Design a binder for this molecule. Sequence first.
Ligand SMILES: Cc1cc(O)cc(=O)o1
Ligand SMILES: [Ca+2]
Ligand code: NA
Ligand SMILES: [Zn+2]
Length: 369
Amino acid sequence: GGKKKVCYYYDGDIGNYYYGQGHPMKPHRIRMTHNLLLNYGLYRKMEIYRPHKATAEEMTKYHSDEYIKFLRSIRPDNMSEYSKQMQRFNVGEDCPVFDGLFEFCQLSTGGSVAGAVKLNRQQTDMAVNWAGGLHHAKKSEASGFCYVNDIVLAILELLKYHQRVLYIDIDIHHGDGVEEAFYTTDRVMTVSFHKYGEYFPGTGDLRDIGAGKGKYYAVNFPMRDGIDDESYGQIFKPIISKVMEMYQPSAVVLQCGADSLSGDRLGCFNLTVKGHAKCVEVVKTFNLPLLMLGGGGYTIRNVARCWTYETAVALDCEIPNELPYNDYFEYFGPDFKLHISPSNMTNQNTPEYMEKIKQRLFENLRMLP
Ligand SMILES: Cc1cc(O)cc(=O)o1
Ligand SMILES: [Ca+2]
Ligand code: NA
Ligand SMILES: [Zn+2]
């Protein structure tokens, strides 16, 4: 279907935002990703844009006025005066107050919405924003290290010109905030693959299928610890092929959270970078306008490898396994290679479990017109 035009979004300030001592979310990983892919030469093959800052008003296309007014006002120096509001909006613990919090949200969001506009205008085939994908944020509260739902805002932009939009989420966590926003409409189908059972955020059972006009337009594949490349590959291409056939979307959003990789500080899966990136290859073959976003990922050397390789896949550009010199070279020892090995952890997802869940999801997809 030909090679694709790619527009990529990055702000050089993004890596300086700091969630605080000990916090696993590290914006620096987006700077590591950028520096690695520049050193592979991938800037020669794509257009690189700075995101604009999304305004408070633009954010209220989804979020409440009261929540956005609070996010644009709260600072470490005035926290004591805002104790009540912090609790209501779920800020100040897992989702801390840090210097420049609102600006970080504006740049994360700006990349996703700018990419959506470029796709709507038919000025690109693919848009990429590795600072986006913050899928847990809700209408009026922060959740799961996410404050503003850049994904929901980008999908609302795509819906100006697309009757049906497909959302796919390969982060290890359930895409709860995106699913909730579109739970009662058939104009967005949401498809999430995730660890389920005594795990954050607690939602995404296979029996969660949507409601009202949106019944059968939410799809959830719950998984156990230790899934590997073979098992994930067993089910991803067949599921997405059936969704494409039945739903017939005109645009796609793919959240590429890297916390589903082997060795993640918070995750419990066993995928390689090649296994994760096979998902990008499958979605790209349908030749639809595609927005590719970031997400979780807590072992930062592997996040940089994953998103560098997935940028190369979007470009159909082969790159060597030997890493080029870069500003973070020491982070990639002791091997200094791009690709990673799986661990010897047990895969609790039997082949029979994988086929049975797939078969139940196929039953629900037969209910589409
Ligand atoms: C992404 C996330 C958020 C959180 O509060 C706990 C966790 O384990 O993972
Ligand atoms: Ca997911
Ligand atoms: Na929906
Ligand atoms: Zn996650």
